[PDB]
Design a protein around this ligand. Structure first.
Ligand SMILES: OC[C@H]1O[C@@H](O[C@H]2[C@H](O)[C@@H](O)[C@H](O)O[C@@H]2CO)[C@H](O)[C@@H](O)[C@H]1O
Ligand SMILES: OC[C@H]1O[C@@H](O[C@H]2[C@H](O)[C@@H](O)[C@H](O)O[C@@H]2CO)[C@H](O)[C@@H](O)[C@H]1O
Ligand SMILES: [Ca+2]
Ligand SMILES: [Ca+2]
Ligand SMILES: [Ca+2]
Ligand SMILES: [Ca+2]
Lengths: 164, 164
């Protein structure tokens, strides 16, 4: 029902944990093709290493190890856990120890950004958001089952979209 | 860029006449969903009343009768002659004598604009431009079979798209 945006897609807060296959899953209120989403932090912190508070963040694992420049670790998928955001604008940390974990950065944002904008890139037919779609906000280490056991926290957010 | 810049959709110039069911037809070189197209005049002129060269234009019928301010009459359709551009941003001339002819204006452009940008509005599934698609650049009086017999000319253009 909406062209452009931002338009709020969620009803209730969308809340994700950092382990245990616990994404924040919801049925979007509006249909169409999305250019991007904007995640607006409401409450909570997650971390990829619970032995310290140093990495606690909205969207990832801040100031961690050797990759302070790849602090993000949130992915918005469809109901099949296929990533829809980000698909552009993100650079990934590629060291083999944690390549599969998919830590990333987006220039202009960090893991403490009050609002995080993630780009879809251009659309293909199967990217349509319809009545049957579900979006899932995942922590990457949870999604990929990489080193999740030492994670903790829970973040709640609103999710806005921009339709094209 | 392929996703984000003007992308040339045609190869050879796209040439349309103003009568005789003679749109300029082509299969786009790139697939996906468009926000807009840009038509770039290359050569030729068309008119909606051939008794003089007064109205000869790139995109319509310039300085004609009652509708100097609605001089445009080009439409980009799919292979079933369904209009895809413009679908927003166009103001139609509604005088009963020529309402069906679908003369229109777009702010900041006229029928001699070297380039004309036409907006699609937001996309639905059936707006996909794929390998089976054919885009057609029509003269409106020819598309709608309204007062076409006194038309003449042929315009050739390049056609660019903005993918989303
Ligand atoms: O290197 C970044 C990586 O650290 C993981 O934690 C390691 C921890 O540092 C190490 O002492 C322990 O032996 O193994 C842990 C992994 O099982 C974090 O879990 C991971 O999220 C990354 O941040
Ligand atoms: O009124 C705009 C309309 O004019 C049509 O031409 C008229 C013409 O002016 C009239 O003298 C003739 O006898 O009837 C024509 C229509 O069949 C143009 O063809 C049309 O394109 C409009 O520009
Ligand atoms: Ca971890
Ligand atoms: Ca998991
Ligand atoms: Ca005519
Ligand atoms: Ca015709």
């Amino acid at each position: 029902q909406r062209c452009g945006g931002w338009v709020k897609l969620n009803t209730a807060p969308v809340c994700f944990s950092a382990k245990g296959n616990r994404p924040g899953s919801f049925t979007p209120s509006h249909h169409g093709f999305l250019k991007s989403v904007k995640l607006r932090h409401l409450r909570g912190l997650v971390t990829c290493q619970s032995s310290t508070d140093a990495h606690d963040s909205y969207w990832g694992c801040k100031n961690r190890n050797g990759f302070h420049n790849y602090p993000l670790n949130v992915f918005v998928t469809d109901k099949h856990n296929k990533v829809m955001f980000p698909k552009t604008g993100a650079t990934y940390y590629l060291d083999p120890y944690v390549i599969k974990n998919r830590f990333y950065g987006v220039q202009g944002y960090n893991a403490m950004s009050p609002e995080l904008v993630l780009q879809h890139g251009c659309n293909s037919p199967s990217d349509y958001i319809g009545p049957d779609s579900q979006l899932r906000v995942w922590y990457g280490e949870d999604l990929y089952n990489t080193m999740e056991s030492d994670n903790s926290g829970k973040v709640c957010a609103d999710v806005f979209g921009y339709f094209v």
